[PDB]
Design a protein around this ligand. Structure first.
Ligand SMILES: [Zn+2]
Ligand SMILES: [Zn+2]
Lengths: 550, 340, 170, 126
């Protein structure tokens, strides 16, 4: 509550000096620059509409000088008039500048000119003469055939493009590259007007035989934006071609995942899974190129955070959609996993692909004990003819959710004489790049903590300070997460979980971290169908109440 | 059911007088009454619009109203064109009342605020009048922009958008009058032919004979119309390009022997000069050797059920005019030769 | 007036058939694999790929840019841009069984040094093919992605409380 | 080599499902001190056929463009008039293919031009 006039009064002169440049957008440059600035033009028009709406017309002369010329320039420009609600807003602006009882000559002239310009948007025959004459002859209003006219205009151009497409290197009429670029420029502003969407999908499939791209990326980015905000729903073949010809669109869309796990829906993995399955990523990641690009952005995020549980979770989900999409659309002719997963043994992947839905609850300890063996072979015996290093075999181990998480929950079940292999496995997960020295230290710390915890479980339901003792470094997240597993698993929990939660919630980061832990765990159980309903309800309750505290 | 008659005819009166320049007395009351009547009609379109005798009864009322008016004498009024124009009758009225210059000031203010309430009702399940006008304006721009950026006049008129479209407009309007059976379609088409631009019209009919059937009654009416009027068919066959009329023939064997008749008689009214080794006509309006060659050219590069026909019509006109085996002599010898 | 021959006109039948195939939208890639199994089947079992990877560098002139500019283009930037991306995807998958000498002639082109409007993908598949050979770690920050990507992504994961793992080894 | 490969099965969804389950259950009993066959036989708990048919083993009876049986109802129908190719195709795939070639010419409902695999005259009647 300060400026009100000033920023808009500056941007006014900017836009009026810009509209005069464009001037009915009959040329290439006027169109491309209109295509860009239109949206900010729309927001300008929102602020402008608020200002003109709250106040009244013919009375005030605030920006009334050349508002008329702005709205003329606007409306006779059709790329303006085509955008979401810019028309609707221009209508509203004009309805603000109308007068009920015009008093001086000027007000009546104004209002007539206002009806004129509305009639020019809506109901003007700026179209081929013979069709006007013929229709007027048949006694039709534009209103009652425009739709079918448009529909026929589109199906024509879409057909044309499909024959351009099929006549690849044939002595026959080659649709003019200029004209294809022309159409593409016109797809942008009315992408969310349903009577083009066949045209679009024809443009994206029908690439043709050029070394050069023909389409201008303002096309690709208009389309990308509209896919992600769900204003378009093409078929999936459309959007694999989109990705596979404009890299910054496929960046722009895997980054629009990242906003979803960061801001909106932190640890609502149902919501994240549903966004990934509705986005077409899985099916488009069946093409090995797009898999490799996507997992590069995943790798860049694994490093910015040093192994953030929230990105680990999104990988686990995404990979599960991808793996189900591979299986599905890979009968004949599929690319071999050293193609998607090139920087590891294909051996290791082929183990880690086998899901725990298809193995019994009892034989999972065996599976993990096999994984520990082959990972230790790859990491400790880091010789020629292998993975490049330990980090790579870890970034693989992430891409399987299930296996990395289940280790703690299986250690508690075998806490009496813990297997050394599991201690290796878990230590590796919470810490790569340590030296054998540091892994053995971590393992024996966890072994002592297993002793204390098994004593505490075989005892009655005890305090929270006894756990705070062992809680009191490089191995903290390991112990925290293992401890929470203990709370949820043992029936000695459901009583003293809150009692440890309150203390362990030093910061908000710990709170969010454990919440992510618990969401991952619920998603994991409800998938794998393994449950004690106590633990399920307890996790839900705790998660519900702690998401309010933050 | 009979309740709807007095409602719809009254609204049809108001719609026709929407365009008319008497507007001094009209007010918010007239406007609000109009739009709520139109909502009632649009609501019926939704409720009991399909599979009803009331449906067919309203179309009887429409067509008999649209034929007592005709498009002749008192007003060439478009009118609401069909039962689907029920679904956007409000829109017609509203668009036309903007176009009405005589619209009084305060009525226009109440009007425009009743049509364009604002984003105060942004949340609506029902496609309201503001959103309806939206989609229109968008499409209108949409069609300008495509026409002027990537539209091309297809050679093969049958596959042009506009010819295809205008054809299918005509065929809706013919099917209505066919079922109505009040006047013969012959009368309608003859009057069309006289009233509007002929060059456009012919091309369209042409394109209409080729669209596959949609509900071939349409094509079966127009062929009988054309055989009924030879004189228009003389300008039809003269005005178009060759391939169009050729695929016309392989579709309708009923036009073949008359069309070959037309040129057969156009061939015979030339004369060959020895100075320029070329057939030519006497008058300015006599078809060239090249346009005639063209048309028979196309008819030969066609299906077998026309090839034999054209071949034998030329052989029988060769024998008739001396069975010479040299040029200078028979237009028809010239052709047969020119083909190899 | 506007007849053009296909730029693989003058090639050995099987590679002609491979490259004809990869033309075919995003199912180009698999088609390609299918193509090779259905050439292992036929009389000339071996694919002398370095016949093709020579062929992929071999230049000819084109005249584009202003109405007057002679340029020399290799094959790789001449045949259809969808064949480019589908090719490199097929090479990833077949990397082991290629001679390195010919293969690095491709990547030289691919890296797309000192060109305006480069093939975003091809550049990227350079980087992705070099990481898979093990000669072009390159000692840059040389990742497939844009600076814009990598920047925005560091800028957003900055809004997440970093994990206690140790993955960087200073 | 002797170590575990990336592997998977083609055939009947009802026949293959049990083998996949059994494989996922015995896959920890892979051993790189045996042979590949001596691991596969006792992991999948089976013996193999040593050429159950050596003559009519399989001829790939797929499109040879798209390499699918069942493209939208359509079957591998259109073939080569050649003893050395014989390769089936689809109506759709072969039309899209031949339209594109410079060697192709189209009569009324006929397309003449070269079989993709062997470059011999092949005819397509739509
Ligand atoms: Zn096929
Ligand atoms: Zn063949």
């Amino acid at each position: 509550m300060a400026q009100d006039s000033v920023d808009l009064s500056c941007d006014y002169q900017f836009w009026m000096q810009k509209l005069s440049v464009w001037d009915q957008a009959s040329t290439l440059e006027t169109q491309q620059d209109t295509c860009l600035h239109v949206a900010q033009f729309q927001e300008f028009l929102r602020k402008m509409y608020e200002a003109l709406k709250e106040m009244d017309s013919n009375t005030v002369i605030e920006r009334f000088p050349t508002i008329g010329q702005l709205l003329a320039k606007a409306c006779w420009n059709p790329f303006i008039l085509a955008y979401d609600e810019s028309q609707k807003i221009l209508i509203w602006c004009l309805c603000c500048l109308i007068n009920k009882e015009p008093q001086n000559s000027g007000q009546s002239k104004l209002n007539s000119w206002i009806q004129g310009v509305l009639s020019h948007i809506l109901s003007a025959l700026r179209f081929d003469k013979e069709v006007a004459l013929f229709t007027q002859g048949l006694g039709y209003a534009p209103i009652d055939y425009y739709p079918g006219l448009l529909k026929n205009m589109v199906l024509s151009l879409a057909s044309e493009l499909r024959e351009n497409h099929l006549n690849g290197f044939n002595t026959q009429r080659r649709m003019a590259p200029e004209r294809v670029a022309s159409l593409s420029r016109v797809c942008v502003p009315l992408i969310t007007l349903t009577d083009v969407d066949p045209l679009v999908e024809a443009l994206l499939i029908c690439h043709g035989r050029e070394p050069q791209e023909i389409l201008q990326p303002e096309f690709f980015e208009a389309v990308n934006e509209a896919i992600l905000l769900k204003k378009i729903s093409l078929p999936m073949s459309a959007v694999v071609c989109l990705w596979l010809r404009h890299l910054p669109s496929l960046e722009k869309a895997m980054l629009h995942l990242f906003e979803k796990l960061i801001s909106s829906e932190r640890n609502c993995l149902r919501r994240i899974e549903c966004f990934i399955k509705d986005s077409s990523l899985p099916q488009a990641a069946c093409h090995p190129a797009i898999f490799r690009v996507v997992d590069e952005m995943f790798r860049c995020a694994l490093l910015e955070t040093d192994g953030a549980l929230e990105i680990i979770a999104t990988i686990q989900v995404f990979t599960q959609c991808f793996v189900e999409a591979l299986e599905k659309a890979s009968k004949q002719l599929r690319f071999a996993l050293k193609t998607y997963f090139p920087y590891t043994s294909p051996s290791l992947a082929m183990v880690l692909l086998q899901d725990p839905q298809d193995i019994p609850r009892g034989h999972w300890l065996q599976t993990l004990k096999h994984i520990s063996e082959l990972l230790r072979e790859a990491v400790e015996d880091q010789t020629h003819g292998s993975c490049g290093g330990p980090f790579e075999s870890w970034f693989l181990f992430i891409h399987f959710g299930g296996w990395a998480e289940m280790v703690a929950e299986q250690l508690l079940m075998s806490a009496a004489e813990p297997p050394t292999a599991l201690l290796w496995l878990l230590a590796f997960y919470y810490g790569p790049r340590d030296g054998r020295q540091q892994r053995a230290q971590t393992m024996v710390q966890v072994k002592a903590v297993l002793g204390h915890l098994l004593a505490m479980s075989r005892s009655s339901s005890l305090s929270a300070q006894d756990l705070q003792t062992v809680a009191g470094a490089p191995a903290q997240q390991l112990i925290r997460h293992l401890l929470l597993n203990f709370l949820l698993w043992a029936p000695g929990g459901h009583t003293i979980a809150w009692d440890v939660i309150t203390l362990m919630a030093h910061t908000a980061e710990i709170t969010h971290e454990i919440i992510g832990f618990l969401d991952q765990t619920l998603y994991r159980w409800n998938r794998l169908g393994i449950e004690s309903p106590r633990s399920e309800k307890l996790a839900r309750e705790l998660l519900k109440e702690l998401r309010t505290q933050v | 059911m009979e309740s709807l008659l007095q409602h719809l005819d009254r609204f049809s009166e108001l719609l026709a007088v929407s365009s008319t320049t008497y507007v001094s007395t009209w007010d918010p009351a007239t406007v609000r009454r109009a739009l709520q009547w139109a909502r009632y009609l649009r609501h019926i379109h939704r409720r009991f619009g399909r599979h009803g005798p009331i449906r067919t009864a309203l179309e009887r009322r429409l067509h008999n109203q649209w034929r007592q008016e005709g498009g002749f004498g008192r007003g060439p009024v478009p009118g609401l064109a069909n039962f689907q124009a029920l679904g956007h009758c409000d829109v017609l009225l509203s668009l036309r009342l903007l176009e009405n210059r005589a619209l009084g000031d305060a009525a226009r203010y109440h009007l425009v605020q009743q049509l364009f309430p604002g984003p105060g009702v942004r949340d609506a399940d029902e496609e309201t009048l503001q959103e309806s006008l939206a989609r229109l304006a968008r499409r209108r721009s949409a069609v300008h922009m495509l026409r002027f950026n990537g539209y091309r006049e297809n050679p093969n008129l049958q596959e042009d958008s506009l010819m295809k479209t205008q054809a299918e407009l005509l065929l809706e309007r013919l099917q209505e009058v066919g079922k109505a059976e009040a006047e013969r379609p012959a009368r309608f088409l003859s009057s069309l032919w006289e009233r509007l631009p002929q060059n456009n019209f012919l091309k369209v009919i042409a394109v209409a004979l080729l669209q596959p059937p949609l509900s071939g009654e349409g094509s079966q009416v127009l062929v009988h119309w054309l055989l009924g009027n030879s004189e228009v068919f003389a300008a039809f066959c003269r005005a178009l390009p060759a391939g169009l009329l050729t695929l016309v023939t392989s579709r309708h064997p009923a036009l073949s022997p008359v069309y070959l008749g037309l040129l057969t008689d156009w061939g015979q009214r030339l004369h060959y000069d020895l100075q320029k080794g070329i057939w030519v006509g006497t008058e300015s309006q006599d078809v060239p050797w090249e346009e005639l060659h063209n048309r028979f050219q196309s008819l030969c590069q066609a299906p077998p059920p026309l090839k034999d026909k054209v071949l034998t019509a030329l052989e029988t006109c060769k024998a008739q005019d001396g069975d010479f085996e040299v040029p200078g002599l028979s237009i028809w010898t010239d052709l047969l030769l020119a083909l190899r | 007036e506007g007849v053009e021959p296909a730029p693989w006109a003058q090639l050995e039948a099987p590679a002609r058939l491979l490259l004809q195939a990869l033309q075919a939208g995003p199912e180009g890639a698999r088609r390609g694999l299918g193509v090779l199994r259905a050439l292992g089947s036929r009389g000339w079992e071996p694919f002398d790929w370095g016949r093709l990877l020579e062929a992929l560098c071999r230049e000819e002139p084109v005249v584009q840019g202003p109405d007057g500019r002679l340029e020399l283009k290799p094959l790789l930037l001449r045949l259809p841009r969808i064949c480019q991306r589908n090719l490199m995807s097929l090479l990833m998958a077949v990397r082991p069984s290629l001679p390195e000498s010919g293969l690095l002639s491709v990547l030289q082109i691919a890296q797309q040094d000192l060109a305006p409007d480069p093939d975003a993908w091809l550049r990227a598949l350079g980087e992705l093919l070099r990481r898979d050979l093990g000669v072009g770690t390159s000692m840059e920050g040389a990742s497939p992605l844009s600076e814009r990507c990598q920047r925005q992504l560091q800028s957003l994961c900055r809004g997440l409380g970093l994990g206690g793992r140790r993955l960087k080894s200073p | 080599p002797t170590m575990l490969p990336e592997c998977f099965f083609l055939g009947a969804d009802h026949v293959v499902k049990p083998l996949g389950i059994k494989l996922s259950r015995n896959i920890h009993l892979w051993d790189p001190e045996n042979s590949v066959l001596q691991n596969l036989k006792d992991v999948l708990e089976i013996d193999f056929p040593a050429r159950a048919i050596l003559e009519k083993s399989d001829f790939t009876m797929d499109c040879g463009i798209c390499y699918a049986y069942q493209l939208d109802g359509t079957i591998p129908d259109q073939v080569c008039d050649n003893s050395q190719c014989g390769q089936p195709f689809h109506q759709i795939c072969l039309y899209e293919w031949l339209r594109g070639l410079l060697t192709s010419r189209q009569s009324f409902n006929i397309i003449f031009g070269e079989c993709p695999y062997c470059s011999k005259p092949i005819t397509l009647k739509m």
